[PDB]
Symmetry: D2
Subunit: 325 residues, 4 copies
C-alpha cells in the first residue's frame, strides 16, 4: 500500500473544524474504495507549514494538501473570479458552478499545466463569509471607513479598500494574535472559522453580510495521481465527490447553530437590511470586477464563463456600463 500525507488547517476536532471533518471522511472513503491500497495520514493544524510551503510540498512530493486562497492565488490568480462578491445566490448555485461549470474545469487544467498538481475538489467548509471587528458595529460599507482589516489574500484587500478601509495579508495561524494585539481591527470568514480560531475572544461585532462562498481546495501531487491505476484513480474521484457532498450537507445544516453560538459567547450580531446589503453589493461588486480586469489582467472569457456558470451572465457588462460616461 501507499501512504500519503494529507495536510490541512485547524485542529483535529470534527465539531470545531469542518476541514477536519472532510479530511477524516476522505481518509475513510479513500481507504475503503481502494481496498486499502491508498492510505492517508492526517497532518492538521497546518503543522507541516503555512500556505505557500504546503503548496510547494504538494506540487513536488507524493502527498495531498487542502489549500486556501492564500496558497492557490499566487499560482492561479484566475481563482479570484470565483470570489466576485454576491456571485452565488444560494448554495445550489455554487455547487453547480464548481461541479459542472466550464470556468472551474479550466481552473483545474490551468493549475495542472502550471505545476502538474491536480485540483481534485472544492471543499465547502463554512457558510457564506461574514465580517468581524473590534472597533464598532458594521451594518453598511460606510462603517468600514478608517479600519484596518486582516486579509487572507489580495482579493480581500481590494474589497476592504472598496469600502474605505485598508487591508493587510496575515497568515491564518497569526490572525488571532493580530486581532488580539490590534495589528488589525477585523477580518472576514464564515462562522466556522470565527469559532475555530476563537476569534470571538478578540472581536465583538459580527456582520452577517454573506458576501462570498466559503471554500478550500483539495490538491494532489500530479506525478502520484497520474501513476495511479485507472481503478484507483476512479476510486479517489468517487471518494472526493462523496466526502465533498458530506461536507456540504453538514456545513449547511450547522450555519445558523454556529451563528447563534457566536451570539451566545457575547458577540453582537448585526443582520444588514435589504438596503445595506444592496450597498455592500454596489460598493463591492463592480469595483471588484474592475480590479479583476485591470490590476489582475483577467480576460473577459474567464469572467464570462464564471458568470454563465453562476447564473449572472450580465454582471461584467453591467459593471462596465455603471462606470461608462
Amino acid at each position: 500500500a501507499t501512504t500519503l500525507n494529507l495536510s490541512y488547517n485547524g485542529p483535529p476536532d470534527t465539531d470545531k473544524n469542518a476541514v477536519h471533518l472532510f479530511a477524516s471522511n476522505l481518509k475513510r472513503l479513500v481507504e475503503e474504495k481502494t481496498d486499502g491500497d491508498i492510505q492517508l495520514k492526517l497532518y492538521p493544524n497546518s503543522m507541516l507549514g503555512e500556505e505557500q510551503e504546503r503548496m510547494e510540498q504538494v506540487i513536488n512530493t507524493p502527498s495531498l494538501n487542502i489549500a486556501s486562497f492564500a496558497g492557490l492565488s499566487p499560482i492561479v490568480p484566475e481563482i479570484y473570479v470565483s470570489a466576485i462578491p454576491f456571485l452565488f445566490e444560494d448554495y445550489e448555485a455554487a455547487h453547480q458552478f464548481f461541479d459542472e461549470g466550464d470556468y472551474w474545469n479550466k481552473v483545474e487544467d490551468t493549475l495542472e499545466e502550471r505545476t502538474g498538481a491536480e485540483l481534485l475538489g472544492v471543499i465547502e467548509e463554512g457558510g457564506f463569509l461574514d465580517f468581524t471587528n473590534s472597533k464598532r458595529p458594521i451594518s453598511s460599507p460606510e462603517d468600514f471607513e478608517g479600519l484596518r482589516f486582516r486579509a487572507m489574500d489580495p482579493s480581500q484587500v481590494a474589497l476592504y479598500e472598496a469600502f474605505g478601509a485598508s487591508g493587510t495579508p496575515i497568515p491564518w495561524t497569526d490572525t488571532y494574535m493580530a486581532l488580539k494585539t490590534n495589528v488589525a481591527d477585523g477580518q472576514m470568514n464564515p462562522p466556522m472559522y470565527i469559532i475555530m480560531g476563537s476569534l470571538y475572544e478578540v472581536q465583538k461585532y459580527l456582520t452577517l453580510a454573506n458576501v462570498q462562498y466559503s471554500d478550500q481546495f483539495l490538491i494532489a501531487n500530479g506525478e502520484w495521481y497520474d501513476d495511479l491505476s485507472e481503478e484507483n484513480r476512479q476510486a479517489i474521484e468517487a471518494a472526493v465527490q462523496e466526502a465533498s457532498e458530506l461536507n456540504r450537507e453538514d456545513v449547511e445544516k450547522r450555519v445558523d447553530e454556529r451563528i447563534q453560538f457566536l451570539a451566545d459567547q457575547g458577540m453582537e450580531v448585526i443582520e444588514p437590511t435589504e438596503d445595506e446589503l444592496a450597498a455592500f453589493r454596489e460598493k463591492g461588486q463592480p469595483a471588484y470586477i474592475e480590479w479583476l480586469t485591470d490590476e489582475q489582467g483577467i480576460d473577459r472569457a474567464w469572467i464570462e464563463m464564471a458568470l454563465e456558470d453562476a447564473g449572472q451572465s450580465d454582471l461584467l457588462a453591467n459593471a462596465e456600463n455603471l462606470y461608462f460616461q
Copy 2:
C-alpha cells in the same frame, strides 16, 4: 462591426465539400445571432496556406481556421488518442465523446495553454474512414504488405505500419498528384474527400473499413475570442453547435450515396466481412495503442481518460 477571415480546405461547393457546408452555415448563423456585429469572410481551398501555416495564422492574427489532424497534431499530439481504430461503434458514440468527454475538454484547454488559440468545435465532415489504392484490392490487413500509403499525419503512418505498409506525410493539396505519379499507392479518407479530390481518377480499389471517425477542428484566435462580450461569445457558441449539428445530419444521410458515386466512377468496392473487420481491429487496434503509449509516449492517464469517455476502458 468586425469581419474575420475563416480559412479551410476544399472548393466552395456545398454539395461536394462538407467543410464548406459547415463554414457557410457558420457564417450565416454568426452574422444572424450577433445582428451583424461579427461577420465572417470565407477563404476556401486552403488558399491562405497549408495546414501548418494556417495554424500559425490563426494563432497570431484575429481570424478563424478549420484545421485537420495535420495542422493540430504537431501542437497537441494528444489528439491521436481520439483516432484509436474502431474506438467508436457508431456516430452517436463519437458525438458523446467530443460533446461531453473529459478527455476532449482537456485537449481544448491544452491547445489554449500552448498557443492561446481556442478550439471551438469538432466538425463532422465525412463518414468513417476508408482505404483507397491503385495496386490491388484490400480485404484484410495482409493485403497492405509492401504498399506505400500517403498519410495525413503520423497516426496514419502508425496504422499503415501495423498492417505492413509504409506511410509518409503528404499535404492534402498534393495528394491527387502524389497518387497520380505513384509517389504513393494509396491513402485513407471518408468517401467525401475521395470524391472531393477526384481521387477515383487515380485510385481503383476502395475498402469500406470504416476504421476511424472523420473530423476537422474549428479554431479561433485567442486574443480576439477571449475579449468578446458575453453576448457575442454566446452567439458564436450557439452558432457553432447548430452548424455542427447540421453537418452531422447532412454527412450521415449521404455516406451511402457517396459510395455509390465512387462505384459509378469505376471504383471496385470491397465491403469486408465480419471476420475481416475483426482482423483489421485485432491487428490495428492494439498496435495503435502501443504506438500511443510506448512509442509516442503519451501518458497513460490521457489514454485512460479517453477510453473511459468512450466506454472502452477494456482496451487498456
Copy 3:
C-alpha cells in the same frame, strides 16, 4: 513622453532606505538617458500593495516593481537556488553571478515565459544577512533550538529548521509588530532593514552571520518593455546598470556604520567564531540543498548551473552523498 510607476518597500528617505536610493537614481538616470521620453513616478512604502499584489500589478499593467523573495518565490521558486547559505564569499562573487551567470539568465527567461514580466536587474540593498532575536545571544547553530523566527519566505523557514528553530512567514509591513508582540522571537535581514523597520526597538541580540546576499529584484511589465524602441530599451538597460552600481557602492560603504548605529541603539553584537561559522555552513548547506531537490522539486540541472557560476560545483554531490 510616458510615465511609469515604480513601486517598492520602505520610506522615501535615501539615508534610511537603500531601495529608495536605487529608485531615485534610476528615476534620474532613466529621464536623462531617454531625453525625457520615459519618466518614473516613485511609489514607496509598499503603498500600492504588499508583495503578492505588486507582482500581480507589474505582470498585468505597464509599470515597474521592486520585489522581494516573498513576491517572486511563489512564481519562480528556482530563485531559491541563489540563496544557498554562504554561496557567495564576497560581494563581487554575487555581482558577476547575477550580472552574467547562466543560472540567472535562465531565471530571467523563466519569469518571462511564465508571466511575460522582465527581470531587469538584481538590486543590492543591504550587506549580507544577519540574525536578530529578543530571547538570547546566538553564536552557534545550537542556539537556534526552540526559537521561533519570522520568515520572509519558505527558504528562510528551511534554514531555521536546519538549525532547530521554527519559522512563520510574516509580511515585511507587519514584521515589527510580530516581534513586539512575541509572535516571533527573531528574524533575518541585513543591517539596512533592521534599521529601516526600527527592529532594534524590539530585538536585543544581533548575530553577524553574513549568511546570505541581500537583494531585491527590479521587474518590468513585459508588454511595456517589449514595445520600447531599441533606443529606449538600451537607455533603460544603461540606467539600470548605472543605478545598480551606485547602490552597490553605497551599500557596501555603509554596512559598518549601520552596525555601529545598531550597537548604539543597545543591540548586543556577536561575531560567531570561525568554528561556529563553519558549523552554520556545514549544517545549513546540505539541509538547504536537500530542501531544494526534495521539497521544492528543483532538478539537478538548475542547481548545477548555479554552483558552477558560483565556483562551488561540488556542493550538490556532497549534499547527496
Copy 4:
C-alpha cells in the same frame, strides 16, 4: 548502463552524410567521456519516423533526436528568426550567433519551457543553402516567377512567395520523388543534401545563393538530461561541443569539392555576383521580416535581439 536511441536523417555513410559524421562522433565521444554510463544506438535514415513523429518521441521518452526546421518549427516558431535571408556574412558570424547569442539562448530556454526537451547543440551539416530546380536557371529573383518549390517548412514557403514562386511542404524522405515526378520543380538545401538525396538526378540547375545557414538541432529528452550528475552533464556537453566542432571543420572544408561534384554530374552552376546577391536580398529580406512580425507573431524585441547578435 543507459542505452539511448539517437535518430537522424540520411544513410549511415560518413562521406555522404554530415549528420552521420556528427552522430557517429557523438556516440564515440559520449561513451568515452561518460566511461560507458551512457551508450547510444544509432537510427539513421529517419528509421524511427519522419520529423514530426521523432519530435514527439524525444519529448516523451528518454532518447536523442537530430531535428530539422520541419520538426522544430511547429513547437518553437521563434527559430524562424535565425533563417532571415542573408542574416550571416560568413560561418564565423553564424557560429558566434548560435554559440554566444542572447536570442538563441532564449530559443533554447523556450523549447525547454514548452516541452521539457533540451536543445543541446546546433549541428552544422552543410554549407549555406542553395537553390535547385528542373525548369530554368535562376540568376535573378524574377526567375522564380511561376515555379513551384518543395518547402521544408513554412519559412521556405514565405521566401519562395517573396520571389514569386509557390511552395508546398514535403518531407525530406519524399523530396527526391516529388522532384522526379514534378510534384515540385525545385527545392533549397546545401550541396551536402543535394548530393545525399541524389537530387542532381532530378534537378538540372544550381544557384549558389548561400542564402541561409544550414543546421539541424540536437535535442535530448528533458527528464533524462536534467537529472544527470555534474560529471555526466559536463561529459555530454563536452562531447556535443567537440562533435559540433568536428562537423564545422569538415563541412566547411568540403563545400567547394561538393559543388564541383554536382557540376561533374551535369548540374549547371550559377555563382551569383555581389550585385546579383543584392537583388535577391532586396526581394527576399524585407518580405521575410514582415512575415515574421505579422503572420508569425514574433515581436520586434525577438527580431532586434537576433539582428544585434548577428551584427546587423
